């Protein structure tokens, strides 16, 4: 009788920081960033099949199926990622011998809308392996292998911190250093802070981002071509993660709100399409409706915004909101990061 | 100097049984209602204030001011549930005499959304006051508390899940029976459960409700005038509210969906503006692209709905939702009930 297991993992919304993850910056002055797991996941579900084949299946409905041989599957271009995660499995702990099964993916935010999707469906898929092979993979290892799949294996650019999020869950502040080295630091924040922040958090989804992997490349560019006034804002992105973190264990919400406003001058400022004519004008009227400071959540360019407003404001503000094109949420956050459970033997 | 409190409770998705919560029919008969918390709130605050006054703000930012005087304050219609926990609060803990303060709400649901926010709103005021004079109520009171405040000082007619669901948190059956006598089984759902149902549910926001008074006023007139069948369509509801019970605490999708099915005919048969050509039309589409089952969460004739969808049908039933008015999210349980903190004092 075959097998079906499913693994999930929470996405993630940047509060500071996003940025001085790219390799260039984290490798020659170190990276902070400061994120925090949300209620929105990204799922992968392995089922073992009895026919002779592999079947891989996305979030936007491709699907592959192969023969099964004892070559490792090409990466061709078509679902790389599924494939990469399934070679790697293959190779390093069923002894180079194929599985017949079907990984299907699939997600409650598309790729661009900032809550670092792309990185923790890779995490997932490793996650539903884990739990399908009952591999002793502690979080550290599958933050890292799945930073190895989609960078090296699969050649795809990109930051440190979305593996870590979807990996570990809850708020973090994360440390970047060269030669692949990352510290993970859980904080601890008190109830009644994550209480009055969720009450203080509006989330606006924008639409789909499709500057993610130019603002990435700008920020790297920044640092090899020496672009003086573009790494100042780069060490200043850096500098406001440790001040929020910092407001965070004190509840210290003054000093939040002020450095998420330091923090988004300094974001917009280390590449030319962060925002635009677009998001500045629904970042505006957020502002005129009471909202104290805000930022996009991701690389930038589009996807989800947050807006910190005190309560006395929020109604007006999620009116306000409501004015623009695209859709307003709350913002509640998870302490579990990934999980897998079994639904056939 | 002031003090601030705030308080919030989560709102609730109708999983089954509603209906059989109405005054004739859980007098008569006995009634059922499985229901579960969300991941979205209604909020309270109180300031205290430093002018001899009391002022009143609601989540459509109305505004009422008072003078402070030693007499109960007027029900006169305009923010009457406010006024009435106020006037309860100051008669029964502070020997009568006034407490210069500012009580406002706001929600993460309009009225009509069938999230049960108009409830939990009074919920979360009392809980407000609980924190505020550090009263000993027990959560059976605070609901009882509600439920009085709510339906007879302030004369409004409804049901009896709400209050429960918003003040206990979690997934809940709670058996209706005459005098005003609730009794809540908190339900201890196995995490696999909790994490497949969630995988397997969209939910789906159709717009405001303005059908519950009338459909809650037909269906306390099938019980009073013996309307036959429209009293078998609620005994039906009953009945498989607790099948749906049992399917969660067994693990039993199969039944689950079965179940919904059959409650969901029950409960247009009950009252006749329960579904309409809008709502049928939504229903059948999600149906159409997969999904196995669905009901309006509350009363009926708009407000959020609910489907169950297996994962594999899952991004379909989402890209089709898309096609139609309403906004489409996730669905994230939340186990705990009304919670306080303070900011000020
Ligand atoms: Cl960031
Ligand atoms: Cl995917
Ligand atoms: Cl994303
Ligand atoms: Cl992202
Ligand atoms: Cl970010
Ligand atoms: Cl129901
Ligand atoms: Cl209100
Ligand atoms: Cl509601
Ligand atoms: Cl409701
Ligand atoms: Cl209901």
Not at 183 to 199: G, H, Q, T, Y
Not at 204 to 231: L, M, P, W
Not at 251 to 276: E, H, I, Q, Y
Request: with cysteine.
């Amino acid at each position: 009788n075959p097998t079906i297991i499913r693994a999930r993992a929470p996405l993630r919304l940047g509060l500071a920081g996003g940025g001085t993850d790219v390799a260039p910056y984290a490798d020659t002055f170190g990276g902070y960033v400061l994120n925090a797991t949300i209620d929105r996941y990204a799922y992968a579900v392995i089922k073992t099949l009895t026919i002779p084949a592999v079947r891989f299946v996305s979030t936007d409905q491709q699907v592959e199926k192969h023969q099964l041989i004892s070559e490792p599957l090409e990466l061709n271009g078509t679902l790389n990622l599924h494939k990469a995660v399934y070679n790697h499995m293959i190779r390093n702990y069923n002894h180079g011998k194929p599985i017949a099964l079907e990984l299907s993916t699939f997600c409650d935010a598309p790729a661009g809308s900032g809550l670092g999707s792309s990185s923790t469906l890779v995490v997932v898929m490793i996650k539903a392996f884990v739990e399908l092979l009952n591999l002793p993979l502690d979080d550290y290892a599958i933050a890292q292998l799945a930073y190895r799949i989609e960078r090296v294996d699969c050649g795809l650019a990109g930051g440190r911190q979305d593996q870590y999020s979807a990996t570990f869950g809850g708020f973090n502040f994360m440390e970047f250093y060269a030669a692949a080295r990352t510290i993970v630091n859980p904080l601890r924040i008190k109830n009644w802070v994550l209480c009055e922040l969720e009450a203080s958090l509006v989330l606006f989804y924008t639409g789909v981002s499709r500057e993610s992997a130019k603002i990435i490349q700008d920020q790297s560019d920044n640092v090899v071509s020496h672009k003086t006034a573009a790494i100042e804002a780069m060490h200043g992105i850096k500098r406001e993660a440790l001040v929020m973190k910092e407001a965070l264990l004190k509840g210290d919400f003054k000093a939040f709100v002020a450095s998420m406003r330091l923090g988004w001058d300094n974001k917009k400022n280390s590449a030319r399409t962060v925002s635009n004519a677009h998001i500045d004008e629904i970042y505006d009227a957020a502002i005129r409706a009471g909202a104290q400071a805000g930022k996009v959540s991701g690389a930038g360019g589009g996807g989800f915004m947050l807006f910190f407003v005190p309560t006395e404001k929020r109604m007006d503000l999620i009116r306000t909101l409501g004015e623009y094109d695209g859709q307003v949420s709350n913002c509640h956050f998870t302490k579990n990061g990934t999980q897998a459970w079994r639904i056939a033997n």
